[PDB]
């Protein structure tokens, strides 16, 4: 019967758990015990970016460590010149519930998305000189949560319909549809080689996907509430997942273990953003307690508690060259840390 | 600075001026989140993923937001509604079968962590099928709800001119079943405003206006530590 056929998953999961336990030989904490401790890190706010009118929900860095784009509920995308605190573009959106923003790794395209079930993609440079929507990306039966550009023609979007999609910009159609998540997929991050990407949904699971051929390679679990933010390792063989259970966990692709968990007994809030510095051993995780807390990735402990945000921080990302870290919060402010 | 920088700073100042103009509009419109369920009466009150309905009472502007194709999980997208003036909740109140589901929905939206300072404007919409089903013996609240022995006799009430005594004594049970779960928490942070209305009602947008005025009045009084 259907129950008899579905029962095989029980022993399959038992076998995979046994294999995972067998592959475990030494935790990361023991391996990095004798490494030189990271010096006391002090980051001070260098620039604050005012101008947004509502809670900032997403930010993304351009591939020059100079331009960043932010989205807020007033219905406007603002592109900032971080070095000079200058506003480059202010794009009013049709929908006023955007919760994701993407910067193409060329400087030509910016993609938004929210409760409109549409991933609008805009032309930054035009013969008309004004930013216009290249074409709306309909096809999702739920709110979008994360969009990440593959190339100037391919984009990968995660939505609330428990489905991630690969879109061809020219045809405006879902080239590939990823399925398997059992919940509102909230975050996805790409690898340095743009062939693999991970996803994070509300089933407290992380799924590894192949861009070209679809298909899910490995599933990652260990979280207790959900995953609100994900980020690949700079090397590309690991990733750290945010959550609402006050735990950040880093998983290794080559082993599928949970190498370390980043959590302090005095933290009960949720993580909304995670990113890595340009060495690997610095995991920056935003927190709901109006703060962002810097963790040493190798030795699971605390190295920085930089603060100054009035409301919860929602977005965070390190530049490509590791120059600075930008944090976005619900107080309509972006702050650059160095 | 240089010539290009002095021309990029000026362009940024135009954006700030435009952002200032939209600020005046943004803080002058009171966003509302219309919630409820299927076959509850959203379309009657009103007449992709989200549908905006903009109406204006007196001189103030309102921005209603009705969710569409969103899955049956309000979590992870209700966080976007924290600056909303109020939440419009529509209950059919005449089904008499999916009323415990409405009660659970109201409890979930009232006890949500993010919706701690957000009031709920209750619209017990379509109090006409209720009258036609109470006048007839088909649907009695006693069967579905085994707590009608007390009957929720109204110590205070404002019945419309011309009303069956059972009609005005069974609808207040519906109102009390919601006010009981509304008053069980909050601790004065936010309050519920129940109303009785039909499918077609000209005086439906005015109730929203009055409730929103009361909500912001309560919010302003708490800033002076007078409440």
């Amino acid at each position, epitope marked *: 019967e259907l129950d008899q056929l579905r029962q095989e998953a029980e022993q399959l999961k038992n076998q995979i758990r046994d294999a995972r336990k067998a592959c475990a030989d030494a935790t990361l904490s023991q391996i990095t015990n004798n490494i030189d401790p990271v010096g006391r890190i002090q980051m001070r706010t260098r620039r604050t970016l005012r101008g947004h009118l509502a809670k900032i929900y997403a930010m993304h860095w351009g591939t020059d460590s100079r331009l960043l784009v932010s989205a807020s509920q007033d219905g406007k995308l603002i592109i900032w010149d971080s070095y*000079t605190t200058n506003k480059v573009h202010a794009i009013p959106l049709r929908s006023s519930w955007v919760m994701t923003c993407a910067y193409a790794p060329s400087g030509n395209y910016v993609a938004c998305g929210g409760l409109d079930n549409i991933c609008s993609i805009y032309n930054l440079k035009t013969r008309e000189g004004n930013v216009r929507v290249s074409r709306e990306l309909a096809g999702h039966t739920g709110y979008l949560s994360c969009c990440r550009f593959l190339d100037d023609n391919q984009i990968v979007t995660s939505s609330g319909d428990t489905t991630c999609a690969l879109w061809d910009i020219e045809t405006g159609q879902q080239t590939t549809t990823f399925t398997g998540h059992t919940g509102d997929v909230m975050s996805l991050s790409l690898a340095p080689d743009t062939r693999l990407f991970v996803s994070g949904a509300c089933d407290a699971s992380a799924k590894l996907w192949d861009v070209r051929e679809g298909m899910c390679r490995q599933t990652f679990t260990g979280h207790e509430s959900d995953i609100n933010a994900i980020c690949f390792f700079p090397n590309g063989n690991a990733f750290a997942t945010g959550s609402d259970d006050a735990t950040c966990r880093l998983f290794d692709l080559r082993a599928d273990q949970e190498l370390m968990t980043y959590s302090h007994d005095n933290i009960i809030c949720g993580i909304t953003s995670v990113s890595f510095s340009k060495s690997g051993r610095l995991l920056l995780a935003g927190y709901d307690d109006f703060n962002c807390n810097v963790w040493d990735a190798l030795k699971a402990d605390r190295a920085g508690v930089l603060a100054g945000h009035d409301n919860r921080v929602s977005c965070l990302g390190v530049t490509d060259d590791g120059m600075a870290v930008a944090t976005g919060s619900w107080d309509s402010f972006l702050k650059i840390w160095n | 600075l240089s010539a*290009e920088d002095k021309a*990029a700073v000026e362009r940024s100042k135009m954006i700030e001026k435009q952002l200032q103009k939209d600020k005046q509009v943004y803080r002058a419109t009171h966003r509302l989140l219309l919630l409820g369920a299927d076959n509850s009466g959203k379309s009657t009150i009103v007449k992709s993923g989200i549908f905006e309905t903009k109406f204006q009472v007196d001189k103030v502007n309102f921005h209603m937001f009705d969710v569409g194709a969103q899955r049956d999980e309000r979590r992870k997208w209700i966080q976007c509604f924290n600056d909303v003036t109020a939440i419009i909740f529509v209950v059919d109140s005449s089904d008499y079968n999916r009323l415990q589901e409405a009660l659970n929905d109201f409890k979930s939206i009232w006890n949500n962590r993010w919706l701690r300072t957000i009031s709920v404007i209750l619209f017990l919409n379509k109090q006409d099928l209720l009258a036609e089903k109470v006048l007839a013996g088909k649907s009695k609240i006693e069967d579905y709800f085994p707590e009608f022995a007390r009957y929720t006799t109204p110590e205070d009430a404002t019945p419309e001119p011309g009303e069956d005594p059972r009609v005005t004594r069974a609808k207040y049970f519906i109102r009390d079943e919601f006010l009981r779960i509304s008053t069980a928490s909050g601790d004065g942070r936010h309050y519920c405003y129940p109303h009785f209305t039909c499918s077609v009602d000209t005086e439906n947008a005015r109730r929203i206006f009055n409730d929103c005025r009361d909500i912001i009045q309560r919010m302003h009084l708490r800033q002076y530590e007078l409440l």
Partner: single-chain antibody
Amino acid sequence: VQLVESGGGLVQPGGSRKLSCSASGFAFSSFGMHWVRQAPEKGLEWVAYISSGSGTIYYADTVKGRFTISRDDPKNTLFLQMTSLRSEDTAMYYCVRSIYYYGSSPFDFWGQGTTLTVSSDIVMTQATSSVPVTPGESVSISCRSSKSLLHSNGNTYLYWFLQRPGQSPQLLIYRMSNLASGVPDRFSGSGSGTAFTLTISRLEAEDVGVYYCMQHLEYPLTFGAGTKLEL
């Protein structure tokens, strides 16, 4: 993108006149355009510049306080009204659109112009005003800057231009390195803070013409003689 101007014609000296453009192709509000002069046989000469919102007004030494400039945004039309004229003002007044943010391409598009036959600064030199070339070979025009154009920001603010005979100028190289849109990838340029060279690899047809060099550091905004490339 399109611009067409009107107002040209023979006028006696001292006769105040005005001319206007028609930018009915793009967004006039976000672009700050200029006026560029060009004598029958001479180089270019920047005239004025009106920014977005008509907030910043700039002029040249020979045109300061003379050619009042105005912008009519609702009608998408740029104005430059001139008072009593002199014999010097005998140059076509080309219209050039320009935008300014990080990554912009100022002087991206040019109109067609208009003739007005009327009966200290950063001086730059364009040596070898006539260089012979052949198809398939390569050339190297050179231009120099009395003062270093390498600002502390890290850019260089060098602009290269081309004007085919009987045609409006087009932008090729901006900030000494970046290639403008719509031009072949064979065009390239580099140089130090004082020395500037432009290399045209794999010469082909339609490249025969005159090429210009101008500064965008500082605003007296100046040009060069114009190296004519002929077969």
